[PDB]
Design an enzyme around this catalytic site. Structure first.
Site, PDB file in Angstrom:
ATOM      1  N   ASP A   1      -0.561  -0.336  -4.868  1.00  0.00           N
ATOM      2  CA  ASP A   1      -1.263   0.775  -5.579  1.00  0.00           C
ATOM      3  C   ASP A   1      -1.507   1.810  -5.899  1.00  0.00           C
TER       4      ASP A   1
ATOM      5  N   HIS B   1      -3.117  10.895  -0.998  1.00  0.00           N
ATOM      6  CA  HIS B   1      -2.474   9.862  -2.201  1.00  0.00           C
ATOM      7  C   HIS B   1      -4.391   9.753  -3.081  1.00  0.00           C
TER       8      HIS B   1
ATOM      9  N   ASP C   1       0.628  -0.759  -0.350  1.00  0.00           N
ATOM     10  CA  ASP C   1       0.416  -0.154   0.016  1.00  0.00           C
ATOM     11  C   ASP C   1       0.623   1.194  -0.324  1.00  0.00           C
TER      12      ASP C   1
ATOM     13  N   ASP D   1     -21.432   5.746 -29.999  1.00  0.00           N
ATOM     14  CA  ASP D   1     -22.515   5.703 -29.957  1.00  0.00           C
ATOM     15  C   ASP D   1     -22.904   4.513 -31.223  1.00  0.00           C
TER      16      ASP D   1
ATOM     17  N   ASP E   1     -19.680   6.687 -21.887  1.00  0.00           N
ATOM     18  CA  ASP E   1     -19.936   4.888 -21.578  1.00  0.00           C
ATOM     19  C   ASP E   1     -18.126   4.555 -21.861  1.00  0.00           C
TER      20      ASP E   1
ATOM     21  N   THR F   1      -6.709   3.662  -2.170  1.00  0.00           N
ATOM     22  CA  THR F   1      -6.596   1.726  -1.945  1.00  0.00           C
ATOM     23  C   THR F   1      -7.608   1.160  -2.578  1.00  0.00           C
TER      24      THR F   1
ATOM     25  N   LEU G   1     -17.621   4.158 -25.255  1.00  0.00           N
ATOM     26  CA  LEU G   1     -18.021   3.595 -25.986  1.00  0.00           C
ATOM     27  C   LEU G   1     -18.150   4.576 -27.268  1.00  0.00           C
TER      28      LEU G   1
HETATM   29  C1  LIG Z   1     -14.216  -1.973 -19.677  1.00  0.00           C
HETATM   30  O1  LIG Z   1     -14.500  -3.743 -19.826  1.00  0.00           O
HETATM   31  C2  LIG Z   1     -15.687  -3.440 -19.191  1.00  0.00           C
HETATM   32  C3  LIG Z   1     -16.104  -5.279 -19.488  1.00  0.00           C
HETATM   33  O2  LIG Z   1     -15.883  -5.852 -20.596  1.00  0.00           O
HETATM   34  C4  LIG Z   1     -17.088  -3.202 -19.682  1.00  0.00           C
HETATM   35  O3  LIG Z   1     -18.398  -2.785 -19.062  1.00  0.00           O
HETATM   36  C5  LIG Z   1     -19.092  -4.147 -19.987  1.00  0.00           C
HETATM   37  O4  LIG Z   1     -19.769  -3.899 -21.245  1.00  0.00           O
HETATM   38  C6  LIG Z   1     -20.466  -4.513 -21.728  1.00  0.00           C
HETATM   39  C7  LIG Z   1     -21.293  -3.234 -22.471  1.00  0.00           C
HETATM   40  O5  LIG Z   1     -21.695  -2.156 -21.994  1.00  0.00           O
HETATM   41  C8  LIG Z   1     -21.816  -4.789 -20.770  1.00  0.00           C
HETATM   42  O6  LIG Z   1     -22.771  -5.566 -21.531  1.00  0.00           O
HETATM   43  C9  LIG Z   1     -23.616  -5.550 -20.723  1.00  0.00           C
HETATM   44  O7  LIG Z   1     -24.393  -6.489 -19.833  1.00  0.00           O
HETATM   45  C10 LIG Z   1     -25.625  -6.208 -19.285  1.00  0.00           C
HETATM   46  C11 LIG Z   1     -25.674  -7.057 -18.154  1.00  0.00           C
HETATM   47  O8  LIG Z   1     -24.650  -7.527 -17.495  1.00  0.00           O
HETATM   48  C12 LIG Z   1     -24.422  -7.640 -16.080  1.00  0.00           C
HETATM   49  O9  LIG Z   1     -23.665  -9.395 -16.300  1.00  0.00           O
HETATM   50  C13 LIG Z   1     -22.597  -8.688 -16.007  1.00  0.00           C
HETATM   51  C14 LIG Z   1     -21.614 -10.226 -16.116  1.00  0.00           C
HETATM   52  O10 LIG Z   1     -21.856 -11.010 -15.468  1.00  0.00           O
HETATM   53  C15 LIG Z   1     -21.581 -12.238 -14.769  1.00  0.00           C
HETATM   54  O11 LIG Z   1     -20.130 -12.400 -15.679  1.00  0.00           O
HETATM   55  C16 LIG Z   1     -20.050 -14.071 -16.298  1.00  0.00           C
HETATM   56  C17 LIG Z   1     -19.624 -13.851 -17.615  1.00  0.00           C
HETATM   57  O12 LIG Z   1     -18.931 -12.821 -18.531  1.00  0.00           O
HETATM   58  C18 LIG Z   1     -20.781 -14.547 -15.577  1.00  0.00           C
HETATM   59  O13 LIG Z   1     -20.343 -16.111 -15.938  1.00  0.00           O
HETATM   60  C19 LIG Z   1     -21.315 -14.408 -14.153  1.00  0.00           C
HETATM   61  O14 LIG Z   1     -22.614 -15.306 -13.281  1.00  0.00           O
HETATM   62  C20 LIG Z   1     -21.396 -12.866 -13.966  1.00  0.00           C
HETATM   63  O15 LIG Z   1     -22.294 -12.405 -13.147  1.00  0.00           O
HETATM   64  C21 LIG Z   1     -21.729  -8.208 -15.170  1.00  0.00           C
HETATM   65  O16 LIG Z   1     -20.912  -8.146 -14.385  1.00  0.00           O
HETATM   66  C22 LIG Z   1     -22.946  -7.117 -14.926  1.00  0.00           C
HETATM   67  O17 LIG Z   1     -22.796  -6.034 -13.791  1.00  0.00           O
HETATM   68  C23 LIG Z   1     -22.728  -4.388 -13.870  1.00  0.00           C
HETATM   69  O18 LIG Z   1     -23.782  -4.257 -12.704  1.00  0.00           O
HETATM   70  C24 LIG Z   1     -23.576  -4.585 -11.279  1.00  0.00           C
HETATM   71  C25 LIG Z   1     -24.905  -3.987 -10.634  1.00  0.00           C
HETATM   72  O19 LIG Z   1     -26.313  -4.478 -11.369  1.00  0.00           O
HETATM   73  C26 LIG Z   1     -22.244  -4.270 -11.144  1.00  0.00           C
HETATM   74  O20 LIG Z   1     -22.311  -4.333 -10.169  1.00  0.00           O
HETATM   75  C27 LIG Z   1     -21.191  -4.378 -11.798  1.00  0.00           C
HETATM   76  O21 LIG Z   1     -20.343  -3.586 -11.223  1.00  0.00           O
HETATM   77  C28 LIG Z   1     -21.270  -3.358 -13.400  1.00  0.00           C
HETATM   78  O22 LIG Z   1     -21.834  -2.496 -13.415  1.00  0.00           O
HETATM   79  C29 LIG Z   1     -20.944  -1.391 -13.977  1.00  0.00           C
HETATM   80  O23 LIG Z   1     -21.539  -1.745 -15.633  1.00  0.00           O
HETATM   81  C30 LIG Z   1     -23.049  -1.564 -15.358  1.00  0.00           C
HETATM   82  C31 LIG Z   1     -24.168  -2.321 -17.442  1.00  0.00           C
HETATM   83  O24 LIG Z   1     -24.357  -3.451 -17.221  1.00  0.00           O
HETATM   84  C32 LIG Z   1     -23.410  -0.016 -15.870  1.00  0.00           C
HETATM   85  O25 LIG Z   1     -24.750  -0.084 -16.341  1.00  0.00           O
HETATM   86  C33 LIG Z   1     -23.142   0.943 -15.020  1.00  0.00           C
HETATM   87  O26 LIG Z   1     -22.651   1.338 -14.922  1.00  0.00           O
HETATM   88  C34 LIG Z   1     -20.919  -0.325 -14.425  1.00  0.00           C
HETATM   89  O27 LIG Z   1     -20.542   0.303 -14.719  1.00  0.00           O
HETATM   90  C35 LIG Z   1     -24.252  -6.829 -15.335  1.00  0.00           C
HETATM   91  O28 LIG Z   1     -25.351  -6.917 -13.641  1.00  0.00           O
HETATM   92  C36 LIG Z   1     -26.585  -6.603 -20.689  1.00  0.00           C
HETATM   93  O29 LIG Z   1     -27.941  -6.659 -20.093  1.00  0.00           O
HETATM   94  C37 LIG Z   1     -26.408  -5.710 -22.355  1.00  0.00           C
HETATM   95  O30 LIG Z   1     -27.145  -6.104 -22.937  1.00  0.00           O
HETATM   96  C38 LIG Z   1     -28.205  -4.030 -23.470  1.00  0.00           C
HETATM   97  O31 LIG Z   1     -27.817  -3.965 -24.456  1.00  0.00           O
HETATM   98  C39 LIG Z   1     -27.652  -4.962 -25.600  1.00  0.00           C
HETATM   99  C40 LIG Z   1     -27.270  -3.887 -26.867  1.00  0.00           C
HETATM  100  O32 LIG Z   1     -27.158  -4.905 -27.859  1.00  0.00           O
HETATM  101  C41 LIG Z   1     -28.960  -5.148 -26.122  1.00  0.00           C
HETATM  102  O33 LIG Z   1     -29.292  -5.712 -26.958  1.00  0.00           O
HETATM  103  C42 LIG Z   1     -29.563  -5.884 -25.305  1.00  0.00           C
HETATM  104  O34 LIG Z   1     -31.358  -5.837 -25.543  1.00  0.00           O
HETATM  105  C43 LIG Z   1     -29.710  -4.726 -23.830  1.00  0.00           C
HETATM  106  O35 LIG Z   1     -30.740  -3.597 -23.630  1.00  0.00           O
HETATM  107  C44 LIG Z   1     -31.389  -3.690 -22.421  1.00  0.00           C
HETATM  108  O36 LIG Z   1     -30.988  -2.606 -21.963  1.00  0.00           O
HETATM  109  C45 LIG Z   1     -31.552  -1.448 -22.297  1.00  0.00           C
HETATM  110  C46 LIG Z   1     -30.248  -0.729 -20.880  1.00  0.00           C
HETATM  111  O37 LIG Z   1     -31.006  -0.756 -20.080  1.00  0.00           O
HETATM  112  C47 LIG Z   1     -32.537  -0.685 -22.671  1.00  0.00           C
HETATM  113  O38 LIG Z   1     -33.061  -0.006 -23.069  1.00  0.00           O
HETATM  114  C48 LIG Z   1     -32.931  -1.850 -23.292  1.00  0.00           C
HETATM  115  O39 LIG Z   1     -34.159  -1.703 -23.803  1.00  0.00           O
HETATM  116  C49 LIG Z   1     -32.928  -3.046 -23.360  1.00  0.00           C
HETATM  117  O40 LIG Z   1     -33.653  -3.975 -22.092  1.00  0.00           O
HETATM  118  C50 LIG Z   1     -25.068  -5.555 -22.231  1.00  0.00           C
HETATM  119  O41 LIG Z   1     -24.905  -7.218 -23.408  1.00  0.00           O
HETATM  120  C51 LIG Z   1     -21.646  -5.637 -18.829  1.00  0.00           C
HETATM  121  O42 LIG Z   1     -22.652  -5.350 -18.548  1.00  0.00           O
HETATM  122  C52 LIG Z   1     -20.152  -4.313 -19.080  1.00  0.00           C
HETATM  123  N1  LIG Z   1     -19.235  -5.626 -17.805  1.00  0.00           N
HETATM  124  C53 LIG Z   1     -19.024  -5.033 -16.763  1.00  0.00           C
HETATM  125  C54 LIG Z   1     -18.663  -6.137 -15.461  1.00  0.00           C
HETATM  126  O43 LIG Z   1     -19.374  -4.169 -16.318  1.00  0.00           O
HETATM  127  C55 LIG Z   1     -16.446  -1.933 -20.389  1.00  0.00           C
HETATM  128  O44 LIG Z   1     -17.443  -1.379 -21.656  1.00  0.00           O
HETATM  129  C56 LIG Z   1     -15.230  -1.512 -21.075  1.00  0.00           C
HETATM  130  N2  LIG Z   1     -14.710   0.153 -20.968  1.00  0.00           N
HETATM  131  C57 LIG Z   1     -14.663   0.128 -21.818  1.00  0.00           C
HETATM  132  C58 LIG Z   1     -13.804   2.240 -21.443  1.00  0.00           C
HETATM  133  O45 LIG Z   1     -14.117  -0.222 -22.921  1.00  0.00           O
HETATM  134 CA   LIG Z   2     -21.521   5.821 -25.901  1.00  0.00          CA
HETATM  135 ZN   LIG Z   3      -3.592   6.119   2.637  1.00  0.00          ZN
END
Ligand SMILES: *[C@@H]1O[C@H](CO)[C@@H](O[C@@H]2O[C@H](CO)[C@@H](O[C@@H]3O[C@H](CO[C@H]4O[C@H](CO[C@H]5O[C@H](CO)[C@@H](O)[C@H](O)[C@@H]5O)[C@@H](O)[C@H](O[C@H]5O[C@H](CO)[C@@H](O)[C@H](O)[C@@H]5O[C@H]5O[C@H](CO)[C@@H](O)[C@H](O)[C@@H]5O)[C@@H]4O)[C@@H](O)[C@H](O[C@H]4O[C@H](CO)[C@@H](O)[C@H](O)[C@@H]4O[C@H]4O[C@H](CO)[C@@H](O)[C@H](O)[C@@H]4O)[C@@H]3O)[C@H](O)[C@H]2NC(C)=O)[C@H](O)[C@H]1NC(C)=O
Ligand SMILES: [Ca+2]
Ligand SMILES: [Zn+2]
Ligand SMILES: O=C(OCc1cc(Cl)cc(OC(F)(F)F)c1)N1C[C@@H]2CN(C(=O)c3ccc4[nH]nnc4c3)C[C@@H]2C1
Ligand code: NA
Length: 804
Positions: A308, A420, A121, A691, A687, A159, A689
């Site tokens: 870290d 930090h 740390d 648009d 995000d 941290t 990514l």
């Molecule tokens: C950095 O890298 C990361 C990791 O790759 C990138 O982040 C990823 O980006 C993806 C694209 O944006 C995104 O894909 C989503 O997924 C949606 C659901 O995701 C949930 O599940 C995630 C996976 O967990 C499981 O993983 C393994 C397999 O890999 C399993 O075996 C395990 O069992 C795990 O459970 C999960 O991580 C994610 O958690 C988020 O939210 C949690 C709380 O709810 C948090 O604890 C966690 O930290 C995450 O929070 C972050 O991500 C969310 C976005 O999910 C964000 O909002 C937060 O601010 C935060 O940043 C989830 O629980 C899935 O539903 C999406 O599908 C939609 O879009 C597609 C597009 O084509 C449509 O086809 C589809 O219809 C759907 O749209 C629907 O919803 C719309 C909006 O609500 C709605 O308008 C529409 O009408 C539809 O209803 C999509 O595929 C990943 O979720 C995301 N992963 C992570 C870990 O963050 C990131 O992009 C990179 N950064 C850069 C700059 O490159």
């Molecule tokens: Ca975007």
């Molecule tokens: Zn410290």
């Protein structure tokens, strides 16, 4: 409820966590207050200390001792780490000569080299050089193994965000730990540094290394240690675990040290009190390596020494107060310190207005040590916006300073001399990386890299497939002797059209005019060659960028530049051109000032028009390839094509014009020619990514011309600058930026002065990795070089920081 009636007899530091109401005996049960009654007695023995002495050699096994020097201890796996040295004439690992580990030399039963992560740390990167005299073990690791001059943490350089980024390969915005102290408006819950809400799994996103390992059949030690477990006992526990039977023994371990961060907060990064914490950390490292040597594992195990974040000089008297700025100070909640996050104190206040808040905090005092931002306007390199727990209003605090709400917050909470959390490009925040073992290279220095890349490498070291993360897998293959993951280029999704001359001037109704009707097969067959791409090997040096999504676009060739023009967004996705060291900057001729010309290769229906910009009182326009850099008066007319035009706020035109008129040439001069790729970025939901078309929130008034949120440029040249950019035989050098497209220059406090006083400072703030631009545009760059792909991945993750 924990009915702590059970016992830790034979269960000390067990690896399965049993929940209520059975009592626990694992390395975290203290932090939960759930240990069995006899945990201290049995599991935390301290008798006789941590070292063997001559008089303990061959002793009778006394089970009450913290560690043993009895003859059977090697068989029991529980000797003091110095046992062989004291009682068997062995030498300490540090006194041994550095000897290359060409192949793993593991005991029978070891299916793969274990990975031990030694995390420290607040270990500032400069400690490696400055404390080198008092860290012989760490210095041997660094010089014999693979090391970086420093490793870049994530923002905020706190941290928890950093440790969890190390474990996941994710930005805090994605893993969810976006700071110390958080409010989640959906949960309606608060995460506190001290408390038991932070133990709720819902806060922690992504997939940490220990979970990745377990799901793929690799066993893991438990990463977290209770603060009251002393480091000597941590090391002994790891060593004991390594003596477990093959089916029960973990393959990955972690040790954590609260030092030097703890002392650094009190005494500053280089206080004289800091020497002892460094000696002590080194002693701990020495004990580990001595222990591994005793177990015959010191040429088998991969050890990572990693920090870290660093530590900066910060004192109470360097605090800015929001009360010296705002009148309504009591209507806001401030998350204070080395970063600022602001929200309304009450949501039932319809009088709360973030615009007036930001305005009151903008450029108000000449020496102001923080800058306010709406989070979506933060430099994209920080990747700090896409999470509900990150407040709309953010303050970027200057290094060495604090922000607080009111003076009473400080004196009734000097208490501290270090802190930090600042911008992760700040030198004092940089931290360390060393890898030592059979899988890491021998005596090798690697360039600085970001800590988000480590998760992938640790998965590689363990034979695991990484969860989706923000690293670029393969970009650190140059750290490894073996185990490299061999990445392939992503497939292009959309292929370009190559339009010829298809439209007559009179088919266009764009409201554009140009004084260009000024008028021989010599240089007319010549301009046909230019429109078919005869100069393209000059302006497109690394191949055309690949379009990685489904879209419709045209490659357009010109004498001085080449573009990929999007029929969907009505503007180039990318414009490519080379400016040699000898190129001359010219001016836009008086008669061509407002010249815009239809492009006879592209239909009126897929072109912008001048009328929209005339009617749009807020919005003007600029060009991606700069008219100032045209190679000839006739070539200059190409730069005024409607297909080279993009929408720009007049305030941004100030920034863009200066970059194109002054800086590009300056870079060409300094770097011996540059290749430039520029283009628009649309990220309306911040995000990071690209648009899609139906996500654009603003158009030039009355049109389908979408307004970019940002403009990027990628500036490449030869690393060996004795070769010009357009004839480079070896490695490349790159710098890039992602400039926010804002209608004002409120971000730059000196903007009323000449661009030469403020534009370049703004650009450096928004420095970017090519990889950041790839995410935001869906393009893949450098498809055709003579370099290895891994080297290109490293290039693509590079960030030019402008620190000294
Ligand atoms: C950095 O890298 C990361 C990791 O790759 C990138 O982040 C990823 O980006 C993806 C694209 O944006 C995104 O894909 C989503 O997924 C949606 C659901 O995701 C949930 O599940 C995630 C996976 O967990 C499981 O993983 C393994 C397999 O890999 C399993 O075996 C395990 O069992 C795990 O459970 C999960 O991580 C994610 O958690 C988020 O939210 C949690 C709380 O709810 C948090 O604890 C966690 O930290 C995450 O929070 C972050 O991500 C969310 C976005 O999910 C964000 O909002 C937060 O601010 C935060 O940043 C989830 O629980 C899935 O539903 C999406 O599908 C939609 O879009 C597609 C597009 O084509 C449509 O086809 C589809 O219809 C759907 O749209 C629907 O919803 C719309 C909006 O609500 C709605 O308008 C529409 O009408 C539809 O209803 C999509 O595929 C990943 O979720 C995301 N992963 C992570 C870990 O963050 C990131 O992009 C990179 N950064 C850069 C700059 O490159
Ligand atoms: Ca975007
Ligand atoms: Zn410290
Ligand atoms: O030993 C620890 O850190 C090892 C480590 C942790 C990661 Cl995440 C990555 C690493 O580096 C890597 F990944 F590189 F190996 C290394 N910690 C011990 C300290 C006290 N402490 C807690 O008790 C705690 C706080 C919140 C919790 N939520 N849930 N359990 C929790 C426990 C937090 C501190 C950090
Ligand atoms: Na300004």
């Amino acid at each position: 409820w924990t009915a702590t009636s059970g016992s830790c007899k034979g269960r000390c530091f067990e690896l399965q966590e049993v929940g209520p109401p059975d009592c626990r005996c694992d390395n975290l049960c203290k932090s939960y207050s759930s240990c069995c009654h006899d945990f201290d007695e049995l599991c935390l023995k301290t008798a006789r200390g941590w070292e063997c002495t001559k008089d303990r050699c061959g002793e009778v096994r006394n089970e009450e001792n913290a560690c043993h020097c009895s003859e059977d201890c090697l068989s029991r796996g529980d000797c003091c780490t110095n046992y062989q040295v004291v009682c068997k004439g062995e030498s300490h690992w540090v006194d041994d000569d550095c000897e290359e580990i060409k192949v793993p030399e593991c005991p029978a039963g070891f299916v793969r080299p274990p990975l031990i992560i030694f995390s420290v740390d607040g270990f500032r990167a400069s400690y490696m050089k400055k404390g080198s005299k008092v860290m012989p073990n760490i210095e041997k690791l660094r010089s014999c193994g693979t090391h970086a001059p420093y490793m870049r943490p994530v923002y905020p350089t706190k941290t928890f965000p950093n440790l969890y980024t190390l474990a996941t390969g994710l930005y805090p915005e994605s893993h969810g730990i976006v700071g110390n102290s958080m409010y989640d408006p959906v949960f309606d819950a608060s995460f506190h540094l001290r408390g038991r809400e932070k133990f709720n799994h819902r806060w922690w996103g992504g997939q940490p290394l220990w979970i990745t390992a377990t799901k793929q059949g690799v066993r893991a030690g438990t990463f977290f240690w209770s603060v009251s477990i002393p480091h000597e006992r941590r090391i002994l526990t790891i060593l004991q675990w390594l003596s477990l039977p093959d089916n029960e023994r973990p393959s990955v371990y972690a040790f954590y040290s609260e030092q030097p961060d703890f002392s650094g907060h009190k005494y500053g990064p280089f206080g004289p009190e800091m020497t002892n914490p460094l000696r002590e950390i080194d002693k701990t490292v020495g004990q580990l390596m001595d222990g591994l040597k005793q177990l015959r594992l010191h040429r088998c195990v991969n050890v990572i020494f990693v920090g870290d974040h660093g530590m900066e000089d910060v004192t109470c008297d360097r605090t800015e107060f929001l009360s010296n700025y705002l009148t309504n100070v009591d209507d806001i909640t401030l998350v204070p310190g080395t970063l600022g996050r602001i929200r309304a104190k009450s949501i039932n206040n319809s009088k709360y207005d973030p615009k007036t808040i930001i305005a009151a905090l903008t450029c108000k005092k000449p020496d102001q040590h923080f800058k306010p931002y709406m989070k979506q306007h933060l430099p994209k390199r920080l990747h700090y916006a896409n999470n509900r727990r990150i407040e709309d209003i953010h303050l970027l605090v200057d290094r060495r300073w604090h922000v607080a709400r009111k003076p009473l917050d400080v004196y009734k909470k000097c208490f501290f001399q270090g802190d930090h959390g600042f911008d992760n490009k700040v030198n004092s925040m940089q931290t360390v990386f060393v890898g030592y073992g059979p899988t890491f290279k021998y005596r090798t220095k690697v360039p600085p890299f970001e800590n988000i890349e480590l998760y992938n490498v640790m998965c590689d070291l363990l034979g695991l497939k990484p969860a989706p993360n923000n690293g670029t897998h393969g970009s650190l293959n140059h750290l490894l002797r073996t185990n490299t993951f061999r990445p392939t280029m992503p497939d292009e999704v959309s292929r370009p059209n190559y339009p010829g001359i298809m439209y007559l001037q009179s088919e266009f109704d764009l409201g554009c005019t140009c004084d260009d009707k000024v008028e021989n097969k010599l240089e007319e067959l010549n301009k046909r060659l230019h429109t078919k791409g005869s100069t393209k090997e000059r302006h497109l040096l690394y191949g055309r960028p690949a379009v990685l999504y489904r879209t419709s676009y045209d490659i357009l060739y010109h004498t001085d530049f080449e573009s990929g023009y999007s029929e969907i967004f009505l503007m180039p996705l990318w414009t490519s051109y080379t400016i040699s060291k000898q190129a001359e900057v010219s001016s836009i001729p008086e008669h061509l000032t407002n010249c815009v010309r239809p492009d006879v290769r592209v239909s009126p229906g897929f072109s912008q028009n001048c009328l929209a910009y005339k009617n749009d009182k807020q919005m003007s326009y600029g060009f991606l390839f700069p008219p100032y850099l045209s190679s000839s008066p006739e070539a200059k007319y190409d730069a005024f094509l409607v297909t080279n035009m993009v929408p720009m706020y007049p305030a941004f035109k100030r920034v863009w014009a200066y970059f194109q008129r002054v800086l590009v040439k300056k870079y060409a001069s300094e770097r011996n020619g540059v290749n430039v790729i520029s283009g628009p970025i649309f990220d309306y939901n911040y995000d990071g990514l690209r648009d899609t078309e139906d996500e654009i929130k603003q158009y030039v008034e009355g049109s389908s011309i979408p307004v970019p949120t940002h403009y990027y440029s990628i500036i490449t040249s030869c690393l060996d600058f004795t070769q010009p950019a357009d004839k480079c035989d070896g490695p490349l050098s790159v710098s890039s930026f992602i400039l926010p497209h804002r209608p004002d220059n409120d971000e730059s406090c000196n903007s009323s002065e000449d661009e030469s006083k403020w534009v370049e400072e703004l650009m450096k703030m928004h420095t970017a990795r090519v990889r950041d631009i790839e995410h935001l545009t869906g393009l893949d760059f450098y498809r055709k070089t003579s370099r290895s792909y891994s080297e290109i991945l490293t290039l693509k993750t590079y960030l030019h920081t402008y620190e000294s």
